[PDB]
Design a protein around this ligand. Sequence first.
Ligand code: ADP
Ligand code: ADP
Ligand code: ADP
Ligand code: MG
Ligand code: MG
Ligand code: MG
Lengths: 372, 372, 372
Amino acid sequence: AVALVVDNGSGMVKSGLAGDDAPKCVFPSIVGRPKMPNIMIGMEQKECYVGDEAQNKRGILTLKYPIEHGIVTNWDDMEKIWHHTFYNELRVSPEEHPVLLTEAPLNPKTNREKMTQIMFETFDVPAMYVSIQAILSLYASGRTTGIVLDSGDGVSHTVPIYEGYVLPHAINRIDMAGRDLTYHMMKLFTERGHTFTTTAEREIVRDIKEKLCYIAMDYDEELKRSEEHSDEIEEIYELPDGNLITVGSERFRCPEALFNPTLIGRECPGLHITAYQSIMKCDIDIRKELYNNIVLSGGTTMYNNIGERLTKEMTNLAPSSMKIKVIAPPERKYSVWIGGSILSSLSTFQQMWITKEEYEDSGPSIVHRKCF
Amino acid sequence: AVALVVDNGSGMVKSGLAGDDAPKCVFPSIVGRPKMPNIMIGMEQKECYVGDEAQNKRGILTLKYPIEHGIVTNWDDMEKIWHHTFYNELRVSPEEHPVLLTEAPLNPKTNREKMTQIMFETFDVPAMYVSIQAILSLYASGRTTGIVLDSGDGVSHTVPIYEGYVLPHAINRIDMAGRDLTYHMMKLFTERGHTFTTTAEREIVRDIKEKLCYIAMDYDEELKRSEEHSDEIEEIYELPDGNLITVGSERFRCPEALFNPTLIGRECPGLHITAYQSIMKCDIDIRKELYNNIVLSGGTTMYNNIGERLTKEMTNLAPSSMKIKVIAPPERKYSVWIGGSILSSLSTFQQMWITKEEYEDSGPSIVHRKCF
Amino acid sequence: AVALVVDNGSGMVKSGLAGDDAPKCVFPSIVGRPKMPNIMIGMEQKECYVGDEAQNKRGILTLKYPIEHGIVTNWDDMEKIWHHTFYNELRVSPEEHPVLLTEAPLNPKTNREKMTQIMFETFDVPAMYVSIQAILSLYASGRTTGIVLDSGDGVSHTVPIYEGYVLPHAINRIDMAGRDLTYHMMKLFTERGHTFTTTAEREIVRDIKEKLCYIAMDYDEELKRSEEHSDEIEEIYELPDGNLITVGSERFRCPEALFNPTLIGRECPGLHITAYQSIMKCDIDIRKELYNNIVLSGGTTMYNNIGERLTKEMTNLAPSSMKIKVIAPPERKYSVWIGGSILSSLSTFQQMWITKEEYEDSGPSIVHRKCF
Ligand SMILES: Nc1ncnc2c1ncn2[C@@H]1O[C@H](COP(=O)(O)OP(=O)(O)O)[C@@H](O)[C@H]1O
Ligand SMILES: Nc1ncnc2c1ncn2[C@@H]1O[C@H](COP(=O)(O)OP(=O)(O)O)[C@@H](O)[C@H]1O
Ligand SMILES: Nc1ncnc2c1ncn2[C@@H]1O[C@H](COP(=O)(O)OP(=O)(O)O)[C@@H](O)[C@H]1O
Ligand SMILES: [Mg+2]
Ligand SMILES: [Mg+2]
Ligand SMILES: [Mg+2]
């Protein structure tokens, strides 16, 4: 039977059938609830909107995210999202297809235990398997050795792998991703005169950041040019209500927080520093191959001139006799799903599944012995 | 049982059976009392005239309005008007038909409480329901999203609704309607030589205003043309006593007070300004749909070239990327009654009624929990 | 030379000499313009009234506020207000005294730039300095560590400070203050039968709110008692025209919007929630001292039983091993001015000034490098 690949994250959720080269259903993971009285008798209303319907009618809805920092806070909303994905988006019965789920490294055991319990006791799936996102990201690139720098919506992590062997003592994870960048962008916009506070305004700011941001090679030079050639940097954006907003110096000052987290008041190191620290925790003979297979993945790495900036930063830290090559292939925003689809279509993988009998006999703890 | 739709307002009262496409009995809400001695023995006189009879014999009667600014002042006259409507106009027993009444937004609770008490303890109606006029006006147009600008005889209000959800924090109401326009018309007529003071003269001036008024697209240009091409604007009107009156520049100077209330010494803003302020109090993503569904209702909006003037005024305020469409359908003077008839004929509405038992047990305050 | 302390806000403006323990001139910041024709030849009239004169003759004047949400909208009115303060109230020459101005956090740069330009190019002040209001509020209390919850007329903000170091990433600001409470009070009064629309009526409602409002410890219990013991809550107030108004349940329902902004249709969180969120954004070891130094400031915090309510609300959120102490000293409505006077009288502060030469050489942008 064809397996279901469901990559659930903080911001977006991707779902599809194992065997394709692109996800089938990509939708935001939000739950909307009405806050205004209903007075028009005759129409059929709903108590909760999930997915695109919640985003379209966000004007009269309060929006909640059931996943924060890769950890599920409310399980009812997550169960509703899973039900919507299975019964509305994919329109496939969740009882004849094995499930392949993804999880971030260094997560509490209770999250996996509850996820497995919900999958086996609510949807009654035949089999399921949970895998780390970095492994699937490395699978999607068709390589066996490299360091994966993944940056999603809530969690950014770094995982090195050498010749199919992972080094768990050199795995890094920090909670600083596109959401903090959106908050920083809102704070920067408050200095221009525009104030955004509501959830709909937050989505508008997120869209503005996605459409009109880039990474400057030299931050100081562009900052100097911002006060002298602002006409080149200014960009006009049309708000949904018809007003116009001028985005100027905020185009590159917002993504700069990745390489200097002190702007947003975070003591954690930057991205290049984290990668260098992760490389230096491995053996001496392993570092040479890791320096040449830096793979980028995640939606937060979809900016412009990011690979060149990362290469320049790594050059000033790595020894002058090494070769640094950053791998930023196109369509890398769906690399995890592609890797999961590739993994699920292998004959050797057809044995590493958690069947119903094993879960019923051993219990929910079996996920700590067969899934890694 | 067929329900009774009774829209009672300041100037006129409409009444009919739920299921028709037009009101059955439309008559002015006035109470007439004699002021001259009666010396002709042999005829059967009456102590009070209500409705058309009071208007026909207004020469020897003093006329009183029991409703002012949507608030009932004297309840005896209102009870007499209700009795006349039930027993003379409709000729139906008010004990086998549910009643559907209308009320203006932002009204005192005591008005609703006394109305419900009178309906349940005097006419002994089986069930009753009170609804806002804007909701019925939006029902009559067959829409679910829009901003309703209602202007009756004493009260003009603005209510936005988005996808069946009303925003109570963006509801406006001002006490400036056709009565102030009639007073302004009388004041303008005093400058020509004609003086009107009595109630009958007030009704004559109201008829003149109804028959010979229009809204000028450019007030300044027509004002300039008034002193140079008066022959085009002059109109002859025949008074009931046979005299002739020339209405000239007063044709467009009287309705102009809607867009500039400073003419009649009122500090409240105009109509377009009020609509724009009501639109700007909603969320950013809601404004686009509200700008495209401006619905006009009420008897005061039955002038000529009013939709074009409103569109031109809104264009200069709304952003240059929005589409403004004013909806002024024909027969809009009875839109509230049509909406009430449509609402009362729905199966889903057959449950939202205040039965006799509920009123007797809970008390008169129940109207504050089941009627909105 | 003695410095001038001028705290200009939305509602009121305070001005005095640095060295005193109380402001010298406290007057509303309104600009009045006549709207009626003048027919009495022989009297000397004025084209605009500013301050108490505008408030006394508000019957025949239209009143405008030149400051909205801590942002100056019209600069001509603000310049007139500054001229009135310097030349009429204080009666001191604005050329031999340094100026100390106050500003709210998270404000546009253009506001400060224009303020400095006006101060240096119109009044020709020798030196000036702009400071945040929270810093002065903390100075006035004689402390070094604490969280300041300031609530004025248009803007309410929260600023934590630990041992003289401010945490900019934990500063909150929302636009919800006494003006929205006045609007809510007017809306509540419309349900009793009284309608207030004009600016003079708005000032009357503001006075009623100032004189007859208090905060209920248990909102539900007092709401239940409102429908059973209204005689205890009813209060008689005398309108300027001689009529009497009964204020009953509206005494505590108006200030309740601070702890539940959903009543006035605002999605922003309440006051205790905002304070708790601001405390949780600091480091773990800093929270203990912040929980014990909650300082209240502003005119909107001059209600009754507000400290006890805030303490009770914070107790249910803070851990059961912390000590919560709300600091609400008397005369806290002028805390900002007292703090500014204390700061301006220090010898160490005699160097942090913007002289004429520095402004002339560097330009208006210098205020972004020496004032914080
Ligand atoms: N073209 C783009 N440019 C800049 N940022 C982007 C772009 N596309 C997406 N993003 C950011 O990436 C985030 C999406 O992260 P995603 O990888 O979907 O998280 P998850 O791994 O939980 O699904 C969004 O919050 C958005 O801000
Ligand atoms: N054709 C017309 N042209 C101009 N004004 C009109 C016209 N018809 C009615 N009016 C005005 O509308 C008013 C009637 O208001 P109406 O909607 O009946 O009030 P209510 O909602 O209380 O019944 C009258 O006072 C009259 O001046
Ligand atoms: N005793 C009081 N009780 C309740 N509210 C008050 C009292 N005194 C003042 N206020 C409110 O505080 C507001 C004054 O705010 P203020 O601190 O003067 O603003 P700013 O900081 O801009 O000068 C007024 O709008 C008033 O409604
Ligand atoms: Mg991801
Ligand atoms: Mg009407
Ligand atoms: Mg203040």
